[PDB]
Assembly symmetry: D4
Homo-oligomer: 203 residues x 8
């Protein structure tokens, strides 16, 4: 509309054919098209029909449309606790970049080896908004929130077994931090966090 | 320091004397905000800090005349019902103590949604919107879909039965984050205003 | 019996062969036969044995028997929040039509774009009973309940990931509305809601 | 207005003075029903509204002589045990204040199911049945399978331990909706009568 | 031992080859051998090695050893609410018969059509112990418990979708009955209920 | 009637006067047992029933001299700790009022399991064993594996934190039913003795 | 006996007289430690044991002058906030009564993590570390990753809302056990010091 | 580092190719390499690339590096309640042995037949640390804790059906014991318990 936000397809409840119909209908509008939670088998069914589509395997995201050059004099930090958080981390990063934001990835800096976090603390503190992504104990959000004076958006992930409860423990831990200045989204919702981060970053 | 934020005392686990001790030590540190301060604890505290202002509904205490706002924008504090007013006023008083303009849009739940559209101009003009609701957390979803500004949802613990002291409102809000919505802990109006302040003042 | 209600088969705990035996035994009685939660592979095993059966792919329902012409001077509105709710939405609509009710589908009017709801508010308010079907935040039920002065039956769906909890959050949200005038059924139970709606509509 | 429904005050989060203020403002709006009103709050309210009727068991207050019923049919209020009577009487008083005939079928739980069949003629003759039960929510399932009329099940919070303040009764009732059963929130006898009234008066 | 109870194999955590080793080792002892939760594919791997084994498809149980003639002047009633409860119902019935008990099956008498229950109430009341098996609302246990003056053992089943929660709701309902004289076992544990019923029946 | 069981009043939701009314109506019905009767409610009740016996720990009241036991066997009431004694004594007093011999084997939890083996002869000689435990429900599993008699496990609500007012003890006991174990609701010593009585007297 | 451990009374479910009775019976059994002893129960107990020491914050009571420590190493008792001090002091007093040196590292939560690194030399020098925290249980994860010594995490029940009386802190700590972390029940500072004592004294 | 602890790979969130890259990079460092939760199909993809790797099928663990000779004058007891606990039991035992500890396995001594436990009580009491591993009712931890005056670490397993709740009941039971002297780890985390046991054993 009057806002520059791209169209977003939730490719989970839609089939690969439904998506091609939704994409082809909105390919005559404007902006770019972002599709989240799009399986690798679904993009195979998409590659002939949408030959201009770019698939980001790790993020399970698909973008059709030239990525916008960065539009704001700042960057968003996407901070991850472990490599298992990378899929939802890349979902947020691809979302933030599709929305026109510079993204600095600070991956695999969980508190199990907290020295890695302080080595990249200069990068995290320089961002305008920090997205912290973690599963299991999700303790990294609390540590980051107490160390940066910038808006932090915490993303709980469903990574882990046992008492991780498909992300519920990470969610409860991060909500109990809220070390102030932390705000939380639903489990695995890297897109939603990047949506909010983009609005904060683009002020 | 170095960030511009006033000092914050979490006066729940502290006695009326401990709070007076923290204030006198901080008489070189802006204004002082004290959250979650009961009236019975403020009565014992009123003879000690004669310049202190108590916000009964917010259960908050301010120690020092606030200067002008730091930023010309405003934060919108939106509530679904009058029962949400305590944590709303906690968020509103926190945001104002941090130097933010606050416009209160109270009691506009979706049971009578016409009240919400009447105040939609005020909400959309805000730089950040804090939506506060209990029981059904539906107000966050409606606001999030109607404003293209950051929304921070605060679930309240109002209600019995299946409201589960805010647990249902919290889960409802978390499932609306695909909009511009982000969520804080139950009743944490302070935390919401803390993040809202940072977004508004950048 | 003395009531016009059709026979209903719960084709979930029965195999495609058991269903043909249950159908063939009741095909000498009266009324129509409705079978819910009937997989697409199960209807394939049914098509030779029951050549008069009609399968509604989206609803996962099977009807054997001429659909009754509408029997009451009113219609039931089946209102859905998103396209992912369509399977259980069609389960309710096929049930309500099998019971002899006119059905007006008002699909994909979730509160993410609430303007779509008011565009079809005339249709919803004209119904005698409204079935509201939604997953995730299930907030649409509360919004509809406050806007219509007719009995509303809310159906929580198991659509969604994370903290949706296979419909539990939608269920709790709708139960906490009950904006008065809302009544709730079990997760994904579009049939049960249409059963109650039919009784209200047929008074 | 425009719907025929009396005004409803949720007198739980309001003080005895606030309720009297809402009534005097509404002295142009039918009868006035006030739900969830404690006796300690009604005592302070009794000198203010001398024409008011208090239903002790229902914790409800009515402000105005009810006219005749609007419809010749009746709503059946069915309870499994005497402990369910408060929320039952809340539902019964609400339904009568909305202009519905109410036949009470109380204390007919399945522990002694012979009581249920003795009153089955009254239940089946109803236009709508509200079934109210706690602990095991089994009465809803039995009634739902025995009547071909809309059933609205109300779980109550009676009991300790694994009753979980109505959570088990609620889950039991939700899993009986394949019958003619539909469910409301725990203890929400008002909401059940509200929907029952609409079904009965169409 | 000094008690006549047969050996019981929990064929869930054991593979079809492990079971043949456990069976062959105890086939030189005494009594019969009962194996519960034994998949249909596992009995295929068992049929060559154990050619004297009998598989009860519905119960997912396997018995090696001549079934004992009834040993007590009474019978146990195994009462079921719906056909979906039949697998765990047959698990209890095969267990009770392997332990030397007469079993009277009263199947598919749920409260949705309660008239079926009273038609077989004479049979249920004549038993020395009643095993009530039900899922979803598990309300049948409460109804049976109030109608019979005999020990009742309630078995919650994991049948159902939505808010049935894989048997948790049935379990909570039955525990809240305990209409006195009802006692409860773990979800789907028809064996454990028949174990206790056998001890009560054999006094 | 027709079953030999004494009349049972659930005196929790009833007042001291209501209970006296039920007793006088039942003065043609065996002994009368009243469960879950507080001492403050029994004090108001003591002048009314001067022949009544109160069991303080069990919170139970008996109205009539019990005849001899009906059956020579005995029910074993086994507890893991002294905190379980109230619901244990409720089960013991219920079983004795129903005409069963009761042997109490109290405070034999697995923290000091040597106490359990010292009293194993008494437990194994029982016709039915009621095992009562809170926190870790481990005593049921140990007893169930050691006796070839019906075991009825009663979880108690003793403890805070992750005991969850008996929820953990309940889940532990339910997962031991592969032994000779069957389970009742939290704190339901009455229900356990009710079933135990039926097994013992057949 | 035979293990060197002092006798431990769980004084929560016992009255001030019962505890004095257990002590007089134990006057041949080391020092006597009594945990979870309220001040109102200790006031009635103070005239009875005039040699007894009460630790108000720990709600613990010691009966006998402790000899020297048994082992030259020390146990570190680490807390995230001042609200954790009661269960921390319960753990500290228990560990000292069992003959262990205790170094308290209090109020070093990750909200201000600089306090933690300032005291890291003391924590790393410990033979066993007990980490005690509520709300977010993040302090256990940070400590577990920073020390190569056994860590025993104690969740506390501080907080409302989604802290769930320690349930969230407990789940957070359990998901950090891949470090050197092991977990005890909510608020169980005694149990943590009990295991810590065994590790420290081997 | 200065500590002798081996490198540990969490082979759950990594693919068989990622693991070969992580292993080959750390095969030029020191100590042994332990990889937990490594599927049997993943080791097949590993056997050509890592020909010196040893796979322990039951433990789902992989070790590359000569196992260290025992380094402390004591042994750790790994005590199990049932055969279904053996996978996580062997995960702990392989971890403890990779860390340089003698391990005494006391398997299948659940309280259903408690006499088996006392027969091996001499072995359990002689250990410096006891790891108790149990699912379902996890009652064995409480029984062991009251019988030994040594540090006990309880591991809840996700074995079982119904109300076992994938290990939650065992976890809650063991936490409620903490019979003092018991300490608890997350569900199925035999590695984490052996990590702590190794530190206690190596003092
Ligand atoms: N069997 C086992 N179960 C659980 N953890 C085990 C393990 N064996 C080793 N580990 C250890 O777990 C660690 C992570 O495994 P890795 O291979 O690197 O995998 P990684 O991606 O780094 O971690 C997986 C999950 O743990 C979460 N995490 C870890 C640490 C801290 C935080 C935080 O909240 O700050 C979050 C993280 O968000 C992610 O979702 C490793 O150091 C490894 O030694
Ligand atoms: O008197 P009464 O007005 O019932 O009570 P009221 O104070 O206005 O609110 C009661 C609770 O219901 C919640 N509510 C009501 C209506 C709509 C919504 C929403 O989320 O849209 C929420 C509200 O957040 C509040 O916590
Ligand atoms: N990664 C992501 N995770 C969650 N949501 C994401 C998303 N990316 C975009 N979205 C957004 O979610 C929205 C829905 O996705 P779509 O493609 O249209 O799919 P849709 O069928 O419309 O929604 C799926 C579920 O969301 C429920 N819902 C949505 C909105 C409001 C309400 C209500 O309670 O009123 C309920 C609805 O009941 C349904 O069960 C889209 O606007 C999309 O932009
Ligand atoms: O005295 P007492 O009669 O025990 O107590 P009572 O007041 O009759 O009821 C106690 C609770 O048990 C519930 N109950 C009892 C019996 C049957 C059913 C059912 O749902 O069928 C429910 C009932 O809803 C009530 O909330
Ligand atoms: N979409 C749907 N979802 C849920 N139920 C639906 C349905 N469509 C019809 N139904 C109705 O559900 C009923 C059962 O289905 P059916 O084909 O016969 O299958 P059935 O085996 O009889 O029942 C399946 C489960 O419901 C449980 N149940 C049912 C009724 C009472 C009780 C009790 O606790 O007494 C328990 C029973 O224990 C079993 O585990 C049918 O009458 C059918 O009309
Ligand atoms: O004083 P203190 O003796 O701690 O307290 P105590 O009264 O003996 O019991 C406290 C709770 O721990 C439970 N417990 C303790 C020991 C073993 C077991 C078991 O189930 O084996 C249960 C017991 O059921 C009781 O509810
Ligand atoms: O005053 P205020 O200082 O808010 O309160 P405080 O007493 O210091 O602690 C409040 C709760 O927050 C918890 N907390 C706070 C900060 C960090 C961590 C952590 O786990 O790192 C935990 C802490 O365990 C405590 O239970
Ligand atoms: N249908 C059934 N459902 C559940 N249990 C059934 C059963 N049929 C027999 N059983 C019995 O369950 C027992 C175990 O089965 P098995 O073949 O040996 O298999 P097993 O590995 O020994 O036990 C499986 C699970 O039960 C747990 N368990 C069992 C006993 C005690 C404890 C404890 O906490 O001390 C824990 C154990 O940790 C393990 O995770 C057998 O004696 C068998 O007779
Ligand atoms: Mg990693
Ligand atoms: Mg911050
Ligand atoms: Mg309002
Ligand atoms: Mg928005
Ligand atoms: Mg849609
Ligand atoms: Mg309405
Ligand atoms: Mg009654
Ligand atoms: Mg019906
Ligand atoms: Mg059936
Ligand atoms: Mg009975
Ligand atoms: Mg004791
Ligand atoms: Mg047994
Ligand atoms: Mg602090
Ligand atoms: Mg460590
Ligand atoms: Mg075994
Ligand atoms: Mg010990």
């Amino acid at each position: 509309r009057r806002n520059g936000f791209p169209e977003v397809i939730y490719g989970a409840g839609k089939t690969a054919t439904q998506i091609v119909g939704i994409v082809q209908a909105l390919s005559q509008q404007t902006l770019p098209i972002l599709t989240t939670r799009l399986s690798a088998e679904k993009f195979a069914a998409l590659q002939p029909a949408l030959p201009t589509a770019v698939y980001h395997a790790t993020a399970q995201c698909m973008t059709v449309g030239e990525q916008p050059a960065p539009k704001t004099p700042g960057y968003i930090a996407v901070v991850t606790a472990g490599t298992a958080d990378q899929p939802v981390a890349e979902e947020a990063a691809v979302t933030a970049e599709t929305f026109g934001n510079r993204v600095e990835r600070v991956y695999d800096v969980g508190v199990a080896g907290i020295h890695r976090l302080f080595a990249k603390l200069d990068v995290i503190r320089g961002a305008r908004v920090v997205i912290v992504i973690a599963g299991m104990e999700g303790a990294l959000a609390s540590v980051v929130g107490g160390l940066v004076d910038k808006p932090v958006i915490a993303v709980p992930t469903s990574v882990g077994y046992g008492t991780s409860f498909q992300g519920m423990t990470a969610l409860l831990t991060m909500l109990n931090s809220c070390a102030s200045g932390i705000t939380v989204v639903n489990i695995d919702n890297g897109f939603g966090a990047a949506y909010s981060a983009s609005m904060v970053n683009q002020m």
